[PDB]
């Protein structure tokens, strides 16, 4: 009964943890502008 | 044994979060500072 | 012997009242008197802003 | 018992028009699920 | 002509005569690091919202 709930949050979970290691690793050179969730697809729109 | 661990109300008691030790706490100091002063030597020239 | 300071991070987001409220509370929570001191003047400024 | 507890999110997740921003608190707008077919026009809601 | 000490004969006793300006070098048991790019280093705060 919460199976696309579950699956966008896990994403989001998945999404922040992206955004935070790339942030840690290599500073300053991708800035996050928008995320997007839906199912298991994931998108990103960013600044390189 | 000892008197100053007599709970008589139940405003001090509470439930259990995590336990720690001296040697844990330690070396967790120690892998602190070095890995601080790695972090810093490797982050710039 | 030991002596705090704040820290930050770029990659993590959080809401601005966890740092009001640990602004708040780190005046009555360490020490830095006349004796000793447990914060870097820095930190002392960072929790008078906050 | 799943549907219990599980109803309020189903419920709250269908609206749409939130703020994408990885800087903003919310977390509902993030999710697209049920953020589609709103309009009723695939190059309309589509858009961005 | 040019007016420079370009070539000279110069005898064995006063090859170490040129021995006049003053070096200045740094211990091998301390550190030197770059920080320009650490002033670039820091977190924006959020206005709170309702």
Request: a neutral charge.
């Given at each position: 009964?919460?199976?696309?709930?579950?699956?966008s949050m896990h994403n989001m979970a998945i999404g922040t943890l992206m955004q935070r290691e790339v942030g840690r690793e290599q500073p300053g050179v991708l800035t996050f502008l928008s995320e997007q969730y839906v199912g298991d697809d994931t998108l990103f729109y960013t600044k390189l | 044994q000892r008197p100053e661990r007599i709970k008589t109300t139940p405003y001090l008691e509470g439930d259990v979060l995590s336990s720690d030790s001296g040697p844990l706490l330690s070396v967790f100091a120690l892998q602190e500072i070095m890995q601080k002063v790695r972090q810093v030597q490797a982050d710039y020239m | 012997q030991i002596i705090l300071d704040l820290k930050i991070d770029p990659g993590e987001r959080m809401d601005p009242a966890v740092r009001m409220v640990a602004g708040v509370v780190g005046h009555l929570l360490f020490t830095a008197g006349g004796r000793f001191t447990n914060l870097t003047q820095n930190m002392a400024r960072q929790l008078d802003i906050a | 018992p799943q549907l219990i507890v599980t109803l309020p999110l189903n419920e709250y997740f269908s609206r749409v028009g939130g703020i994408t921003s990885p800087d903003y608190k919310k977390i509902g707008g993030k999710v697209i699920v049920g953020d589609l077919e709103a309009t009723g026009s695939r190059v309309m809601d589509a858009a961005d | 002509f040019i007016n420079k000490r370009i070539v000279e004969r110069v005898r064995v006793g006063q090859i170490l005569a040129v021995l006049n300006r003053r070096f200045v070098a740094y211990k091998g048991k301390m550190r030197i690091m770059d920080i320009t790019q650490s002033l670039k280093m820091g977190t924006k705060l959020a206005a709170p919202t309702v």
């Open positions: 009964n919460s199976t696309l709930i579950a699956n | - | - | - | -």
